Design a protein around this nucleic acid. Sequence first.
RNA 1: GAGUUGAAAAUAAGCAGAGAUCCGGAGAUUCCCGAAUAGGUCAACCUUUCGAACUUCUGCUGAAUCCAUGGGCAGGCAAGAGACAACCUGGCGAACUGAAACAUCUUAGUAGCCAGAGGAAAAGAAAGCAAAAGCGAUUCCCGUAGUAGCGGCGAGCGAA
RNA 2: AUCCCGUGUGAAUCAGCAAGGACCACCUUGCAAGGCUAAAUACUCCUGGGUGACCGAUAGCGAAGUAGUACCGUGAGGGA
RNA 3: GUGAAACUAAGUGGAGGUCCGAACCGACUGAUGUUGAAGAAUCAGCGGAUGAGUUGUGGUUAGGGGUGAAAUGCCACUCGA
RNA 4: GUAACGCAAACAUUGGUGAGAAUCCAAUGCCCCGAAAACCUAAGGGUUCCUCCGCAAGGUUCGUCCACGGAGGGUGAGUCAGGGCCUAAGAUCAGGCCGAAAGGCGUAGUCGAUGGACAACAGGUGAAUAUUCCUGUACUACCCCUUGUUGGUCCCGAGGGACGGAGGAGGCUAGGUUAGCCGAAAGAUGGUUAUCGGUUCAAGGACGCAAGGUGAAGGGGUAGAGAAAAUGCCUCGAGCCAAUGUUCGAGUACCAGGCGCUACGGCGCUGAAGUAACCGAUGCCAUACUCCCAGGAAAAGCUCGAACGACCUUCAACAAAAGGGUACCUGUACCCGAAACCGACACAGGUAGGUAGGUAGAGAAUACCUAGGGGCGCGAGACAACUCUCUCUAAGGAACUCGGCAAAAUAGCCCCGUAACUUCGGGAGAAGGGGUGCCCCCUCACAAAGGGGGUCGAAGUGACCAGGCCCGGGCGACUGUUUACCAAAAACACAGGUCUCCGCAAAGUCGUAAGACCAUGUAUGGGGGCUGACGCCUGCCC
Lengths: 91, 61, 246
Amino acid sequence: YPRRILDVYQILQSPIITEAAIKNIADENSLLFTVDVRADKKMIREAISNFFGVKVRKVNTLIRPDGTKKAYIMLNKEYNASELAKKIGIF
Amino acid sequence: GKAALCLTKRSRSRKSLARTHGFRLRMSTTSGRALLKRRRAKGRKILCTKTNPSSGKRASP
Amino acid sequence: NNLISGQRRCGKGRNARGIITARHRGGGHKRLYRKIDFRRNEKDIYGKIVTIEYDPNRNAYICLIHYGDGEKRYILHPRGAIIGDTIVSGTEVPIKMGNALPLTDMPLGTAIHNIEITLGRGGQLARAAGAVAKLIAKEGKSATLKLPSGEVRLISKNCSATVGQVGNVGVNQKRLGRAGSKRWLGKRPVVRGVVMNPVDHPHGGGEGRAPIGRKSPTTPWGYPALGRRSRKRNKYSDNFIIRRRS
RNA sequence: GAGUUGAAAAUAAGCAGAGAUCCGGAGAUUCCCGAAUAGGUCAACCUUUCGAACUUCUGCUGAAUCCAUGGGCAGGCAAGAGACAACCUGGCGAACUGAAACAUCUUAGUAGCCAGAGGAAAAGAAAGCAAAAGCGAUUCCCGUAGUAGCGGCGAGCGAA
RNA sequence: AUCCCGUGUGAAUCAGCAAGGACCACCUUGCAAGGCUAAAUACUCCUGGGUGACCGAUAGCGAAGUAGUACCGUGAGGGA
RNA sequence: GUGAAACUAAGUGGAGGUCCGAACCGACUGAUGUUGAAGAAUCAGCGGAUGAGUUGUGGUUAGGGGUGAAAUGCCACUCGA
RNA sequence: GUAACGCAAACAUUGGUGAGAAUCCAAUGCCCCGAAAACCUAAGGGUUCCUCCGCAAGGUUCGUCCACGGAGGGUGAGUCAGGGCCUAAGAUCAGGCCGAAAGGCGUAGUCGAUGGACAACAGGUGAAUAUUCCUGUACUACCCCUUGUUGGUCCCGAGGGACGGAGGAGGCUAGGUUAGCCGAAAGAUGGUUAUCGGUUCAAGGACGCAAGGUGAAGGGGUAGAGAAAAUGCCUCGAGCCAAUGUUCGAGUACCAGGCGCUACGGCGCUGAAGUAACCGAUGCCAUACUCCCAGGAAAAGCUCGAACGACCUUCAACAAAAGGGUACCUGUACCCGAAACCGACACAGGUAGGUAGGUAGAGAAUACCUAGGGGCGCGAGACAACUCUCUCUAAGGAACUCGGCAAAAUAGCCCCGUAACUUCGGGAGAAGGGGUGCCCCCUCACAAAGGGGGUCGAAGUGACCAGGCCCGGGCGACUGUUUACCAAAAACACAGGUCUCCGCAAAGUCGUAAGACCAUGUAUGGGGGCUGACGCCUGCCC
C-alpha cells in the first residue's frame, strides 16, 4: 500500500524556468520542478526515475507560501542533467 | 508600569485559542452546534474564526 | 520498592464539578503515596521489621516489613518497636507488640489499634499517631471497645486488630512557629466570618468592628455552629453505640 | 438550425452543414472537510492493516450457570443518523407589564429553549349533542354574543 | 358536573355500565379503558403566471458596485 | 569541669518567612504630564528581593454563578450581580 | 494659518544622483548605545524578505527614499524543531449508573508537552536559504552475505527509567591577560619602536586516569509454590566513577601581511609564525558530596525472565562481523529588549528563553570603551516675560509650612569604640572617632599588604557609585496580603489560644439524581465560631 494520498499518474506540473534553476543544473547536477502539493519524495523519485530511466541520489522539497510544492531532484554523478534538460527545452 | 495594563489580548498560541473556540469544539456541544446553524443562516463567510490546521503554514507545534 | 507510587488525585480541594467544596487547600509540597496494608491479611507467614520511615501523608511513622517467604509490606509503626523486630498475622499468635489477630482470641483490656468495623474491609479505627484502643468487654456476637475519642462502641468480635499503641506519641510538641510552616504543610489561610460583607457570610457587614450580632453563632450556611448535634437521627449503627465522648 | 470556445473580450489554436455552440429529458464522474463513519486530530490535515463507525436486521458461534443473555467472527447496497424559511405536534416554561401599589388574578400556557414529522400537522367515526321535538365522525368561516356566565364579583376572562 | 393525572384503594358486564352541570328517583341518549383514515384549514427559504391611487438610491431587503463584504469584537455577536 | 550530667573557652559549621544590594517582582513620596509621548506613563528617589518568592508553557473553576491572606475587590478598559 | 510636529544621543562637511536634496547614496570627521539601542531563538504576525520600477495616496516636514504602490523572484534536512514513540495536569469515554429533553457521573481505553525517549559537525558558496545546497570527515535505523540456535511474536512477571531544597570544598575547561614567535611599521611635533597586526581549528573514532572522590561499583551458582525480590555460602593482579587530557580527525586547511585587477563591487595569486605562563567562571564533573525537612511525577524506549494463553512457523525468527546498498509528513523567508507581536498611531509603554569581551570595581551596579549597532522622519534663527528639566549662591540656618513636603547633608574599605532595655537571638553599621592619593623601602609567604620614610594638592572612597543619626509616645507582635485606575493602614492573614460538632455508610460541602470532594484520611484526624506571638491574667449575672 504505497502512497500516503493516492493522487494520480500525473503529479509533476512543470519544470521551473529561471536564472537560479539554470545555474543549479550546472552546479549540483540537479533538476527543479513543481509537483502536487500532496506529492511525496518517494512518489517523485519513483515517477521521474521510472519516466526518464535515470537515477536519483536525492529529492528535496518545499512548499512556497501560496501552497504549491516545488522539488529539487538531484541526479547521480553518472547521469548528465545538462544534456538531459537540453532535450526537454530548458536550454 | 512594568506590568502592562488593559490589553485584553496578548500573543498566545493558536493551539490554545483553537481548543477554546475552534470548529471541533463548537461541533461537539449541542448548544454550540446551533451557533453554527445561526452562522450559516446569516451567511457569514468565515464560520468560527480561531481554527488552525495540524498541517503546515499555520501550524502551532 | 513498588509500594511508593506517585499516583496523586491532584488539586484535592475540588469536586467533580470543579468547585472548591473542601476549603483552605492547595499550595503544599509535592508528595507521593505509600500503600499500607491495614488488612494485614498475609496469614501464618512470619515477618521481620527492617526500617522505620517518614510518611509525608500521615502523623504516625510507617514500618517496612520483610516476610520469611520473601515479600515486603508497609504498615503502621507501633510505639515500643525498633529495627529488626518480629511480627505475624493469624489466629493463634502471641500478644507481643505489633502482632495482628482477630478480636475474639485477644485478652481483656489491651492497648490495640487498626481495628476493622466490618470484617473484610481493612482497618479504620485508631490509625493516627498515639492512637490507642482498650477492649472493655465482649457479648455474644460483639466485642465492646473504647475508642481514642473516649467512646465505647460495640463492634463485631470476628474483626481484626493489631496489638500495641501506635507510635510517634510526640507530634503535639510542634510549635510550627510561623505562617509559612502551615502553608507548606498543605493548608491555607482561614478568613474569619465577622470580617466579610453581608453577601458572603451570615456574620458579615456591620460598621466598625462587628460583634457576632445575630442571636446565634452561624456557619457560612446558616446552621448554628457552637452547640447543635448532627448525627443524622436514626442511623443504622445507632444501636451499637453505648457512650458519648469526653 | 449558424456561427461558436462562461463574465468582463484582448491574444493564441481549435471546433463547426457528414450538422457544432445552444436548449430540454435521462445517465456517468464528483479531490478534501462536514451526519463523517478505518484510527487520531487544533474542519479542509496526519497515520494506516485501505476499513459504512455505530446500532435492529442475518449466518455461525459460545462467557461467568443447563437453556439463555453479554460477547467475538462473518456476510451485507445498508434500513437509521444530518440538514430544512414559516406553518404544525409533543416536552419544559419565564418576566417586564395590567390591576393606576401588590401577593389571588393578568401578562400566558405567550416568548424562549428542547425533541419530532408532513406537505400540511393535529383532530376524527359517539360510553356524543339535545329535550320529550329531534340530530347523526371530524375540521374551518358567518353567527348566536360580547349574551349565558366566571372574577381580590376588582383588573379583567368569556362559552356552547 | 364533564376530561386527565401522583398516592392509596378497587367494581360490574348488557336483569349491565356511563352521561344528561352536586346528589337520588324516573325517563332519554350512548357504548369508555385496541388501533387507522382523504377533504375543506394554517404558512412562504422557494418556482411559474399575473397585478399595483407600492419604493426610486437618506426610499425599497441590511445589501441596485465580486454584502452579511470592509471594519470592530477573545467570543457569542454587531455592522456600514 | 564533673561519680556522670550540667556548664564554659577556642576551632569547625552555613541555618535563617536573616541583613545590604542588581536582574526579577512591586507601587511609599514628590515633581512632570491633564484636547498627554501614554484611556495610570516619564523622571528622581522608594519595599521585598531563598521565599506565604517570581515567571513561561498547557490546563481547571462561570453569573439566582465562580473566585476572594475579605476591598463587595477580580472574573477581557464593563461588576452591590 | 493658531496649538502641535512624540525625549535634551548630535550632528557637520565634500562629492554623487536628479526637473528639484537639511532629509536618498558614498566618503571623511564627530558623537551615542554596548546584561544594549548587539547577535540568536519561542509565541505572534503572515510575505513585511530580495530585485527592478513608481511616487497620485500613506510617511506628523521634504523625499530621487521606504515596512508604501506596481512587476518578477525567494524558505531545499534520515541527524535541527514537531508528528509517524511515551505518558502528567486536564480532556473525551465503549459497556455501566443517573436524569422532562439538552445531558450529568464514571471504569476500560484514546487524546493531551511545558516533561521522558531518541542519530552531525566543521569549513565553503550566495541578490534573498543554509547543522537543509557544496567539500571533507561522521553517526541512527532498515535489506544483502559468514557463522550460527531451533523455534519466533505478542501478551505477560520482574529489574530499571526515577526525579527535593540549601550549602560548601576540590578537579577541570570556555573565556581572558601577559610573554615568546612571525610579519608589518613614519603615523611631519622634545624624545622615541617602547609601535600595529596575526598567533585559529568542531562532531566523531582509538586509548589511560592524579595527594579529584569514595575502599561495596560489576558478577557467578544454590535452596523454599520461587525464573526476579528476599535467609544463609563463598570469590575478587582490593579497586571503581568520571569531566578534562594523548593521538587521528588535521603532511588539509584557516591565516596576518604582500603581488595584480578596473569601476563604485569583491577576487585571482601568494602565504610567515601557529607556542608558553598566569587568572579563570553562574559552564562541566555532579541524576556526585554534606546537611535539612516541608519528604521530593508518570509512562514507553531499554535489560532480564519460567511459566500459562493465543498467533506467525521452516524460500524463517533472535545474536554477532567487516564491507556494501537503502533514507517518510510538516516547519525553515523576514521582524521578534520591535516603525512588522501586544498597546486604534512608523505610540517615552508590555513581551518567554540563549550567548556574555576589556580597563577600573566585591559585582550581571556604575563610568569609559571593543565586536556589533545607531545619530531618535520638521528644520533655520533669536536669546524678552513665563513654565518646565537642571547648576550655583554673600549673612542667617526651619524664621517656611497643615507637616523640614521638597532640596541639602551622610556614604566605600581598614582600625579603635559602642548605652538604656531585652523574649539573652538582639538592640548594632548603634552612637562617636581616627586612617585612605602618589613615590621609596623591611619578609625562606599579612590580594599596592602591615609597618617605616619621603612627596603633591584648598581637598586623596578625589569622578560615577555610595547608610543621615538620635530621644519619646499610640497601633499592630513580627516577614507577609489588600481596593489593577484616588485609600497599603491601625484593615486581612499569621504562629498560639479557647469553644462546639463529627466513630466512618463521619460531620460539612456541591448536586433533581447518580455520585464527587472530605480522604485513598480516620479523633495527636477532619468541619465550623471567635480571639490573635510572648508575659501575667480573664471577675459578677442563666
